[PDB]
């Protein structure tokens, strides 16, 4: 597991890769910004954001919830995401 997370290639462990693939990823190797890209696609596509208060994402009965280990997060409090990423990315 990484401690500190430009252009550097990551390989996501299988649980994360599944979510990125559902989001549309055609790849096994990603940049960090390609991971964030597909992660936001996933929330969009699955409509996990709260529809009145769209900074809030409800991820509780979803494979993403399982990864983040929270029922909800705020896009303005992105810690659960960054922490999940260092738990789920192999940094070569």
């Amino acid at each position: 597991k990484i401690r500190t997370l430009e252009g550097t290639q990551v390989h996501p462990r299988a649980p994360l890769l599944q979510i990125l693939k559902v989001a549309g990823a055609q790849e096994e190797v990603f940049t960090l910004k390609e991971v964030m890209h597909y992660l936001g696609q996933y929330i969009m596509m699955k409509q996990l954001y709260d529809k009145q208060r769209q900074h809030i994402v409800h991820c509780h009965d979803d494979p993403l919830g399982e990864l983040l280990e929270v029922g909800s997060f705020s896009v303005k409090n992105p810690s659960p995401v960054y922490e999940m990423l260092k738990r789920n990315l192999v940094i070569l």
Binding site: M36, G40, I43, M44, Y49, Q54, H55, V57, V75, P78
Partner: peptide, 11 residues
């Protein structure tokens, strides 16, 4: 604001 506007506004 929409979720995707908020999302791309991230470090």
């Amino acid at each position: 604001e929409t979720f995707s506007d908020l999302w791309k506004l991230l470090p």
